[PDB]
């Protein structure tokens, strides 16, 4: 039995270093631990066991167990669709970067190009105020012509538009040895990172928590929700992951590797990246902060520099973007296949040709993020939709059902499935810990919050936060509303009616 490169993906190589550097330093690692043992493994285990016992995923599995709580599935399908639209945008930039890599001299290493301004200094070749770097000018002026403000959307970058079209075609065909390659590249990047001048200075910024700043709830809601973005929890795919098992699989001991090892790659990625930020500081005499960007560009401003600071730069630059593209496509294939499970809901009745309709709709809708100033709407797509509060609230209801509306009986089913009984701490976690911690964090965020800013300079207008609230509600308001559809369509008498909607089916 083996799983190869399953845990490794874009969820810990691109997102985790982004969030760790933005919110702060090593202080972010404390909420990443308390949200891991408690609000982590128990939910993953619950989802996997529920998907394995019922032998079905999506929404019908939640129809069988607590038919009243059928709206959970609809919430997980909408958020998956929201993720599918923008997750492919990241793969467009990698295609563009790989496209102009087949050359003797890398374009993101020298000064004097048309897009470059007069303030660039070609460092490492023989401080100075108002100075920038050539690497950042290949991100802020060439791939994405950033426009001041969200009001001005400007024109559309046609070069990036074609790259997105390729990504869709490559995978519209996906749905008509290897898998060890990413680890080698990660090791190579890590080796070239720690053995650099000033590397140890950056590490202390990463492994020394800065307390007294935990009062801000932003550090507390990004952590935990990042864990939920990883592990693929609350995305409506884990409930189908266990459907392929053989009903006699040791589910508890099964994830203990995946339940833990997937968090063992984020630490190594942080080691590899945060060591580079110390180098750029030792080269420009600047704080460990302000060397790069706090938004979703760090993975495209830190790696290309490390690759440049290495012999045979083009050859290694070609392969890194290849592994990024491969991981992104592999992650997108599964997330696009599950949404087409709408067949079970509508009994595409027989033939699933709606994949073509989904791709065309998703392509045209996603063209907004590729226009001038498209990153500004990207943050609103990543801090409120498919992240932030959209997952915490769903998880509070994820299953107080298994905890209160179904615990002891489920443990009997688990013992029947695997043979023995898991420790009783998980049951108490389900009962009181996860729905308690998540509710506390939710109330903390809603009682005292700070407006979100793009890399801590630019603040969105009122309508940006309005659209963020709209897109966040569009996934969390389905569960309370769906009870009004289920109840009030049955007999009607509340006491007698509540009983039927709660009795599970004949599993």
Nearer to ligand A1AZJ (CB atom), residue 32 or residue 108: 32
Taking the complex as a whole, the smallest distance from the CB of residue 337 to ligand A1AZJ amounts, in Å, to: 7
Percent helix / strand / coil, the chain, rounded to 5: 65, 0, 35
Dihedrals phi, psi of 5, to nearest 5 degrees: -85, 75
Q: Check residue 9 for interaction with ligand A1AZJ (CB under 6 A).
A: yes
Closest CA to 55 of 235, 240, 232, 233: 240
Q: How far apart are CA 63 and CA 503, in angstroms?
A: 11
| 127 neighbors 284 (Cβ within 8 angstroms) | yes
Q: How far apart are CA 260 and CA 184, in angstroms?
A: 20
Q: How far apart are CA 27 and CA 36, in angstroms?
A: 15
Q: Determine which residue in the list 227, 335, 401, 414 makes contact with ligand A1AZJ, applying CB under 6 A.
A: 335
Angle between helices 71-99 and 478-486 (to 10 degrees): 150
Q: Determine which residue in the list 50, 68, 241, 306 makes contact with ligand A1AZJ, applying CB under 6 A.
A: 241
Q: Determine which residue in the list 4, 6, 256, 448 makes contact with ligand A1AZJ, applying CB under 6 A.
A: 6
The span of 101-109, 151-159, 326-334, 479-487 binding ligand A1AZJ (CB under 6 A) equals 326-334
Reduced to 3 states (helix: H, G, I; strand: E, B; else coil), residue 391 is: helix
The span of 163-171, 236-244, 410-418, 485-493 binding ligand A1AZJ (CB under 6 A) equals 236-244
Which string of DSSP letters, residue by residue, matches 436-464? HHHHHHHHHHHHS----EETTTEE--HHH
Q: Determine which residue in the list 201, 216, 283, 330 makes contact with ligand A1AZJ, applying CB under 6 A.
A: 330
- Interaction pattern, residues 189-218, with ligand A1AZJ; x per rule: CB under 6 A: ------------------------------
Taking the complex as a whole, the smallest distance from the CB of residue 256 to Cl ion amounts, in Å, to: 17
Q: How far apart are CA 379 and CA 387, in angstroms?
A: 11
Q: Determine which residue in the list 72, 171, 237, 298 makes contact with ligand A1AZJ, applying CB under 6 A.
A: 237
Report the 10 Å Cβ neighbour count for 370.
20
Taking the complex as a whole, the smallest distance from the CB of residue 244 to ligand A1AZJ amounts, in Å, to: 7
Nearer to ligand A1AZJ (CB atom), residue 90 or residue 221: 90
Taking the complex as a whole, the smallest distance from the CB of residue 240 to Cl ion amounts, in Å, to: 21
The span of 117-125, 227-235, 369-377, 393-401 binding ligand A1AZJ (CB under 6 A) equals 227-235
| 230 neighbors 41 (Cβ within 8 angstroms) | no
Nearer to ligand A1AZJ (CB atom), residue 230 or residue 275: 230
Given ligand A1AZJ, Cl ion, none, residue 331, with its beta carbon under 5 to 8 Å by kind, binds ligand A1AZJ
- Give, as ranges, the residues between 11 and 50 that touch ligand A1AZJ (CB under 6 A): 11
Nearer to ligand A1AZJ (CB atom), residue 239 or residue 308: 239
Given ligand A1AZJ, Cl ion, none, residue 266, with its beta carbon under 5 to 8 Å by kind, binds Cl ion
Q: Check residue 266 for interaction with Cl ion (CB under 5 A).
A: yes
Q: Which positions ≥6 away from 395 have C-beta within 8 Å?
A: 39, 43, 228, 233, 234, 434, 438
Q: How far apart are CA 374 and CA 378, in angstroms?
A: 6
Closest CA to 14 of 218, 296, 264: 296
Q: How far apart are CA 209 and CA 359, in angstroms?
A: 44
- Give, as ranges, the residues between 6 and 45 that touch Cl ion (CB under 5 A): 12
Q: How far apart are CA 196 and CA 203, in angstroms?
A: 12
Which string of DSSP letters, residue by residue, matches 483-506? HHHHTTSS---HHHHHHHHHS---
Q: How far apart are CA 18 and CA 22, in angstroms?
A: 6
Dihedrals phi, psi of 246, to nearest 5 degrees: -120, 30
Taking the complex as a whole, the smallest distance from the CB of residue 301 to ligand A1AZJ amounts, in Å, to: 21
Closest CA to 282 of 388, 52, 123, 419: 123
**What is the 8-class DSSP label of residue 120?**
B
Could you tell me how many residues of this chain bind Cl ion (CB under 5 A)? 3
Dihedrals phi, psi of 453, to nearest 5 degrees: -130, 150
- Interaction pattern, residues 287-326, with Cl ion; x per rule: CB under 5 A: ----------------------------------------
Given Cl ion, ligand A1AZJ, none, residue 116, with its beta carbon under 5 to 8 Å by kind, binds none
The span of 4-12, 361-369, 390-398, 487-495 binding ligand A1AZJ (CB under 6 A) equals 4-12
Taking the complex as a whole, the smallest distance from the CB of residue 306 to ligand A1AZJ amounts, in Å, to: 22
Q: Check residue 10 for interaction with ligand A1AZJ (CB under 6 A).
A: yes
Could you tell me how many residues of this chain bind ligand A1AZJ (CB under 6 A)? 19
- Give, as ranges, the residues between 61 and 90 that touch Cl ion (CB under 5 A): none
Given Cl ion, ligand A1AZJ, none, residue 7, with its beta carbon under 5 to 8 Å by kind, binds ligand A1AZJ
Q: Check residue 262 for interaction with ligand A1AZJ (CB under 6 A).
A: yes
- Give, as ranges, the residues between 450 and 479 that touch ligand A1AZJ (CB under 6 A): none
Q: Which positions ≥6 away from 396 have C-beta within 8 Å?
A: 435, 438, 439, 442
Q: Check residue 230 for interaction with Cl ion (CB under 5 A).
A: yes
Residues in contact with ligand A1AZJ by CB under 6 A are: 6-7, 9-11, 230-232, 235, 237, 240-241, 258, 262, 327, 330-331, 334-335
List of residues contacting Cl ion (CB under 5 A): 12, 230, 266
């Amino acid at each position: 039995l083996s799983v190869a490169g399953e845990i490794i993906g874009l969820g810990n190589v691109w997102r985790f270093p982004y969030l760790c550097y933005k919110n702060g330093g090593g202080a972010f690692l404390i909420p990443y631990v308390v949200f891991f043992i408690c609000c982590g493994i128990p939910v993953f285990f619950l989802e996997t066991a529920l998907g394995q016992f019922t032998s079905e995923g999506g929404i019908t599995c939640w129809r069988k167990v607590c038919p009243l709580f059928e709206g959970i599935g609809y919430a997980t399908q909408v958020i998956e669709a929201h993720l599918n639209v923008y997750y492919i945008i990241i793969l467009a930039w990698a295609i563009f970067y790989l496209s102009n890599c087949f050359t003797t001299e890398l374009p993101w290493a020298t000064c004097g190009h048309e897009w470059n301004t007069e303030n660039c200094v070609e460092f490492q070749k023989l401080s100075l105020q108002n100075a920038t770097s050539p690497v950042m000018e290949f991100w802020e002026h060439r791939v994405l012509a950033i426009s001041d403000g969200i009001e001005h959307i400007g024109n559309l970058r046609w070069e990036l538009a074609l790259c997105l079209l390729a990504a869709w075609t490559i995978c519209y065909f996906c749905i008509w040895v290897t898998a060890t390659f990413p680890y080698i590249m990660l090791l190579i990047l890590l080796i070239r990172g720690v053995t650099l001048p000033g590397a140890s200075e950056g590490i202390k910024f990463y492994l020394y928590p800065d307390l007294s700043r935990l009062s801000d709830p932003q550090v507390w809601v990004d952590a935990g929700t990042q864990i939920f973005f990883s592990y693929a929890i609350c995305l409506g795919c884990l409930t189908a992951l266990g459907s392929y098992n053989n009903y006699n699989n040791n589910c508890y001991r099964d994830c203990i590797m995946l339940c833990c090892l997937n968090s063992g790659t984020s630490f190594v990625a942080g080691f590899a990246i945060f060591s580079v930020l110390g180098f750029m500081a030792y080269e420009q005499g600047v704080p460990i902060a302000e060397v790069a960007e706090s938004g979703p560009g760090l993975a495209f401003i830190a790696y290309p520099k490390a690759v440049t600071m290495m012999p045979l730069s083009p050859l290694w630059a070609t392969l890194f973007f290849m592994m990024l593209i491969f991981l992104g496509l592999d992650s997108q294939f599964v997330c696009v296949e599950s949404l087409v499970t709408a067949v079970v809901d509508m009994y595409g009745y027989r033939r699933e040709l709606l994949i073509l309709a989904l791709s065309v709709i998703s392509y045209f809708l996603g063209l907004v993020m590729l226009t001038e100033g498209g990153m500004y709407i990207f943050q609103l797509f990543d801090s409120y939709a498919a992240s932030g509060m959209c997952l915490l609230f769903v998880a509070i209801f994820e299953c107080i059902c298994i905890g209160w509306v179904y615990s002891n009986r489920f443990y009997d089913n688990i013992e029947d499935m695997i043979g023995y009984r898991p420790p009783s701490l998980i049951k108490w976690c389900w009962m009181i810990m996860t729905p308690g911690i998540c509710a506390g964090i939710f109330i903390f965020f809603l009682i005292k919050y700070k407006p979100l800013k793009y890399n801590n300079i630019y603040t969105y207008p009122a309508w940006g936060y309005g659209i963020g609230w709209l897109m966040a509600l569009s996934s969390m308001l389905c569960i309370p509303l769906w009870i009004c559809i289920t109840v009030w369509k049955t007999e009607g008498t509340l006491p007698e009616k509540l009983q039927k909607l709660t009795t599970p089916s004949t599993d």
